[PDB]
């Protein structure tokens, strides 16, 4: 049906190289909390090539022309717009299946997000080289919604920690409830055969 990618710790283009291929095959990929996306190189360089990106502007009127989106959901969304053949109808309908969400919505906060170990800052960069957030280069340029985005995360991470406490509260039983010696036989058939 639908896959729900988490966005923290991932690089920008290394994720959207994967996302743009899994969307031209017919799946629906939803990138969730794209606020915390790492990007390569030190912060001041990535800011310059996004500040110097802002002057890309047709001279006779800019209302027509280069639509600089500023929110870090539509930063990542413009990157997949580059790596799709979006002029054909084969590429217009590859943006009908991508919905990158800034922060985490209520449709998807009670879903289980996935991560891709081909685009992670953990796996891919050498640990002695600097990185930059899509969080605070998008806020530094225009996107005026940084405070009310992190404010809603602690209301999500409040109703998550009480859920993670209560799932392991439910899980603590089924190791101790499994303690009864009554059901002995149905484990001959699985310790032998990959319990």
């Amino acid at each position: 049906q639908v896959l729900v990618l988490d966005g923290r710790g991932h690089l920008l283009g290394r994720l959207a190289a994967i996302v743009a291929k899994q969307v031209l095959l017919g799946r629906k990929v939803v990138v969730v909390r794209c606020e915390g996306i790492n990007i390569s190189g030190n912060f001041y360089r990535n800011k310059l090539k996004y500040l110097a990106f802002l002057r890309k502007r047709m001279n006779t009127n800019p209302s027509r022309g280069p639509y600089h989106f500023r929110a870090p959901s539509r930063i990542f969304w413009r990157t997949v717009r580059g790596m799709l053949p979006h002029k054909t109808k084969r590429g217009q309908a590859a943006l009908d299946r991508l919905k990158v969400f800034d922060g985490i919505p209520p449709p998807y906060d009670k879903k289980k997000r996935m991560v891709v170990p081909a685009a992670l800052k953990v796996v891919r960069l050498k640990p002695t080289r600097k990185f930059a957030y899509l969080g605070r280069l998008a806020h530094e340029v225009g996107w005026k919604y940084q405070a009310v985005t992190a404010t809603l995360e602690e209301k999500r991470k409040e109703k998550a920690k009480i859920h993670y406490r209560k799932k392991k509260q439910l899980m603590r039983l089924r190791k101790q409830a499994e303690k009864n010696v009554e059901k002995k036989i149905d484990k001959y058939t699985e310790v032998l055969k990959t319990h």
Binding site: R174, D186, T189, E190, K193, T194
Partner: protein
């Protein structure tokens, strides 16, 4: 942090390549990313291997520096590595992970009809714990 190392005389699991699954003993290192390993009682002979091919264990050994197969064959069987490798909780995993591969199709029907039994035995008994802790605090 870093509770085990590489060392002259360390048993090392080998992850991939032409020697997957077999154990080797790190005997001597050469340059920054390769070794000179061997296994006498596990059918993999003295040669050089990279370090990203192998996979460290908790089995130190007591060798000289880069001795022959005559004195590795002693400390391999004197330590009884294969028994100590088998009855640990990491060759009970890789063997069961390949016990599921050679699990045949009639065997899966023996699994599925017996898995769906015990997971119902636990549920009508974990409910008996979901009721004897609410009844603690009805008032």
């Amino acid at each position: 942090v870093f509770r085990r190392f590489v060392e002259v005389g360390r048993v090392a699991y080998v992850s991939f390549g032409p020697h997957a699954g077999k154990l080797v003993a790190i005997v001597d290192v050469i340059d920054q990313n390769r070794a000179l390993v061997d296994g006498p009682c596990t059918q993999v002979r003295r040669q050089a291997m990279p370090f990203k091919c192998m996979q460290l264990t908790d089995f130190i050994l007591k060798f000289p520096h880069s001795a022959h197969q005559k004195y590795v064959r002693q400390a391999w069987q004197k330590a009884d590595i294969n028994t100590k490798w088998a009855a640990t909780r990491w060759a009970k995993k890789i063997e069961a992970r390949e016990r599921k591969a050679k699990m045949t199709d009639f065997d899966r029907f023996k699994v599925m009809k017996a898995k769906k039994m015990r997971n119902r035995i636990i549920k009508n008994e974990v409910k008996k714990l979901q009721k004897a802790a609410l009844l603690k605090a009805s008032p």
